Write an enzyme that holds these catalytic residues in place. Sequence first.
Site, short mmCIF file in Angstrom:
data_model
loop_
_atom_site.label_atom_id
_atom_site.label_comp_id
_atom_site.label_asym_id
_atom_site.label_seq_id
_atom_site.Cartn_x
_atom_site.Cartn_y
_atom_site.Cartn_z
N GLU B 63 0.84 -1.19 0.00
CA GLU B 63 0.00 0.00 0.00
C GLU B 63 0.86 1.21 0.00
O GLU B 63 0.59 2.14 -0.74
CB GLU B 63 -0.98 0.08 1.19
CG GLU B 63 -1.98 1.25 1.09
CD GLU B 63 -2.66 1.67 2.42
OE1 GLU B 63 -1.91 1.89 3.42
OE2 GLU B 63 -3.92 1.82 2.44
N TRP B 85 -8.19 -2.04 -0.76
CA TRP B 85 -8.90 -0.95 -1.46
C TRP B 85 -9.91 -1.46 -2.49
O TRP B 85 -10.61 -0.65 -3.10
CB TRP B 85 -7.91 0.04 -2.08
CG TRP B 85 -7.24 1.00 -1.03
CD1 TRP B 85 -6.13 0.76 -0.25
CD2 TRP B 85 -7.65 2.32 -0.70
NE1 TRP B 85 -5.83 1.85 0.52
CE2 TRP B 85 -6.75 2.82 0.25
CE3 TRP B 85 -8.68 3.16 -1.16
CZ2 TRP B 85 -6.87 4.11 0.76
CZ3 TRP B 85 -8.81 4.42 -0.63
CH2 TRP B 85 -7.90 4.89 0.31
N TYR B 111 -4.80 9.25 -1.77
CA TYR B 111 -3.52 9.58 -1.18
C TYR B 111 -2.39 9.82 -2.18
O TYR B 111 -1.72 10.84 -2.13
CB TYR B 111 -3.09 8.49 -0.19
CG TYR B 111 -3.95 8.40 1.03
CD1 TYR B 111 -3.84 9.32 2.02
CD2 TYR B 111 -4.86 7.36 1.19
CE1 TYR B 111 -4.62 9.24 3.18
CE2 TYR B 111 -5.67 7.25 2.30
CZ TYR B 111 -5.55 8.21 3.31
OH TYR B 111 -6.35 8.15 4.45
N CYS B 171 -8.61 9.17 5.98
CA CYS B 171 -8.43 9.17 7.42
C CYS B 171 -7.19 9.91 7.82
O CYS B 171 -7.15 10.47 8.90
CB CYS B 171 -8.30 7.76 7.98
SG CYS B 171 -9.82 6.85 7.91
N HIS B 172 -6.15 9.84 6.99
CA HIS B 172 -4.84 10.40 7.35
C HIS B 172 -4.71 11.75 6.74
O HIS B 172 -4.17 11.91 5.65
CB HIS B 172 -3.73 9.47 6.94
CG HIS B 172 -3.95 8.10 7.46
ND1 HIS B 172 -3.96 6.99 6.65
CD2 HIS B 172 -4.30 7.68 8.69
CE1 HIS B 172 -4.24 5.93 7.38
NE2 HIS B 172 -4.45 6.33 8.62
N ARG B 191 -7.95 11.52 11.41
CA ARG B 191 -9.21 12.13 11.80
C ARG B 191 -10.18 11.14 12.41
O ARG B 191 -11.10 11.52 13.09
CB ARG B 191 -9.87 12.81 10.59
CG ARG B 191 -10.26 11.88 9.46
CD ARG B 191 -11.24 12.49 8.48
NE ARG B 191 -11.53 11.43 7.53
CZ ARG B 191 -12.38 10.45 7.72
NH1 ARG B 191 -13.14 10.40 8.81
NH2 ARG B 191 -12.51 9.51 6.77
N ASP B 194 -10.47 3.45 13.66
CA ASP B 194 -11.02 2.16 14.07
C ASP B 194 -9.93 1.47 14.85
O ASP B 194 -8.92 1.03 14.27
CB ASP B 194 -11.39 1.35 12.81
CG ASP B 194 -11.92 -0.05 13.10
OD1 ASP B 194 -11.71 -0.54 14.24
OD2 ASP B 194 -12.56 -0.66 12.19
N1 LIG Z 1 -6.70 3.95 6.97
C1 LIG Z 1 -7.91 3.79 7.70
C2 LIG Z 1 -9.09 3.75 6.98
C3 LIG Z 1 -10.27 3.60 7.68
N2 LIG Z 1 -10.29 3.50 9.05
C4 LIG Z 1 -11.58 3.29 9.67
C5 LIG Z 1 -12.18 4.57 10.55
C6 LIG Z 1 -13.50 4.46 10.45
O1 LIG Z 1 -14.09 3.48 11.39
C7 LIG Z 1 -13.75 3.93 9.00
C8 LIG Z 1 -13.82 4.96 8.07
O2 LIG Z 1 -14.98 5.70 8.45
P1 LIG Z 1 -15.27 7.26 8.41
O3 LIG Z 1 -14.86 7.88 7.10
O4 LIG Z 1 -16.76 7.35 8.61
O5 LIG Z 1 -14.57 8.01 9.48
O6 LIG Z 1 -12.55 2.92 8.83
C9 LIG Z 1 -9.08 3.53 9.76
O7 LIG Z 1 -8.95 3.43 11.02
N3 LIG Z 1 -7.92 3.68 9.04
#
Ligand SMILES: Nc1ccn([C@H]2C[C@H](O)[C@@H](COP(=O)(O)O)O2)c(=O)n1
Lengths: 282, 284
Positions: B63, B85, B111, B171-172, B191, B194
């Site tokens: 990745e 993905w 990204y 997320c990043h 942001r 999980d």
């Molecule tokens: N690189 C990533 C991609 C996704 N998520 C997780 C966070 C959320 O649980 C969900 C994405 O949801 P959202 O966009 O609603 O925040 O998957 C994560 O921890 N890391």
Amino acid sequence: MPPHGELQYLGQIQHILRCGVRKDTGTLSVFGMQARYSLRDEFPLLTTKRVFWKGVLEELLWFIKGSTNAKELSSKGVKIWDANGSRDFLDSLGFSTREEGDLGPVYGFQWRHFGAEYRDMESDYSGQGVDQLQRVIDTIKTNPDDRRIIMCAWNPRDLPLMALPPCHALCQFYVVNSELSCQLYQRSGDMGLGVPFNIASYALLTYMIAHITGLKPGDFIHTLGDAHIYLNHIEPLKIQLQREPRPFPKLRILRKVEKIDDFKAEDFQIEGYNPHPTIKME
Amino acid sequence: MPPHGELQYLGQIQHILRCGVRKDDRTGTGTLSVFGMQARYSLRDEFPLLTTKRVFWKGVLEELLWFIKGSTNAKELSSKGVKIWDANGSRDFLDSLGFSTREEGDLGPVYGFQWRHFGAEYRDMESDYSGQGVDQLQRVIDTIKTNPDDRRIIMCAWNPRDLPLMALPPCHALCQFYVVNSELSCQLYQRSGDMGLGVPFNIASYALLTYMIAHITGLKPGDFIHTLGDAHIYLNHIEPLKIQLQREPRPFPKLRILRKVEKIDDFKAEDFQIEGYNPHPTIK
Ligand SMILES: Nc1ccn([C@H]2C[C@H](O)[C@@H](COP(=O)(O)O)O2)c(=O)n1
Ligand SMILES: Nc1ccn([C@H]2C[C@H](O)[C@@H](COP(=O)(O)O)O2)c(=O)n1
């Protein structure tokens, strides 16, 4: 009882003094810090030294307006961006064409017009780019659970046009139990001079958005990248760390306001602000 | 002896289980949630690949090289054996976002495109973007060499103008670099996290990225600082995580970079070896 409020800030100063490294006319510095300031029935305006409340409130209204004109903030008696808009400083950046005061596409433009093409500080940018601030308010109202409630001032394409790259790279908001919280990513923090001002700014912004969305203020989370004390600030900071904090003041919003562009300075009153002397550094 | 870096991760799980609040999401299945956390994982002669559950290292590494390539094509990653993905580039998922017209695998300006072409106009995944927008990854590497004291060494993936074209908002959101005493640290603003499924994977990606840039720039790895926004545990994952929390971390492995490498683009998967990784069994 665990350190709360002002003691988070003073704790961060203490940690830097003891564990920070000499990174250079010079600083002590730690990379990666995080403090939590409750906003519930109190407002985090520091009491161990007087913070420039008036500057905080006018700067924020100026950003909210979308303004990139240092003269427009200077007209309200707040000179903090004036050096960055001077003829000489703009000339030193290659912007000899530009009028005095045109800071380029800094916060106000990124917040209201992210991604639009910057011309000068007088142009009309109505309906151009992304109004991140309004988009944040709308998302809070219609989907408070959203985890993408973000406002980003860091725009790599626009950096070379800006008088200053932003310290406040981004903020994110969060809602649960009818409380609105905010986290700020601040890439660089001068702990003696800037940071108390910076905490107050974003706490003020969170109070404003809470008010507009019918929510109650929750936490302000302050995250730093490069957190530093200038070496010339150590002794005064050493005086300050020994003052007893007074309880935080409150912020009263004096009328019901429906849209964030309608806020005005006289809408805001700081109650019970009882600071020790402004005993500040260079 | 200074405690094991992984106890911060397990501590964060525990704080969320103890103090987190019920907050829902689109799936509606629900989370326990806290806003604002921060952990610090030393990278000095160690690599923070978690040991209380096996992490998909192969996935982590491919990745990242995929990102470095600037690709926005789920199929180029899938072809290396890494399916993470794929669901987001499927005809069905793309149709559900109203991209009925887009080719399967085109994830939009995610990204890779942001890191290597921020601000360029996205067309599709096969287009040539050479010399378009800001190459943030290289500007970061260049600044680390020529001005290590700089406080603006940032790489941002969050592009409000491009969000509507992305198959998934990142997320990043951003990451920042820092140098002192010939050590490169890195901070990630994530942001949304999980904690059970993604966070461990995420810790390894940015740890690996920092190792890469350190090797390019003649520095040693320092710290990886992980900062979260909405940190959450799916209710789903509570029993499995309570199982994981029972386990004693093993010492972190080491990351070996098997040849001298000049440009970030020239790293290959074969260049990297994880020495001494001794994880407990994969969970769920
Ligand atoms: N690189 C990533 C991609 C996704 N998520 C997780 C966070 C959320 O649980 C969900 C994405 O949801 P959202 O966009 O609603 O925040 O998957 C994560 O921890 N890391
Ligand atoms: N709102 C602001 C603006 C500036 N600074 C400080 C941090 C740095 O010491 C300097 C900005 O310099 P640099 O961009 O090199 O980080 O001023 C701050 O703390 N808060």
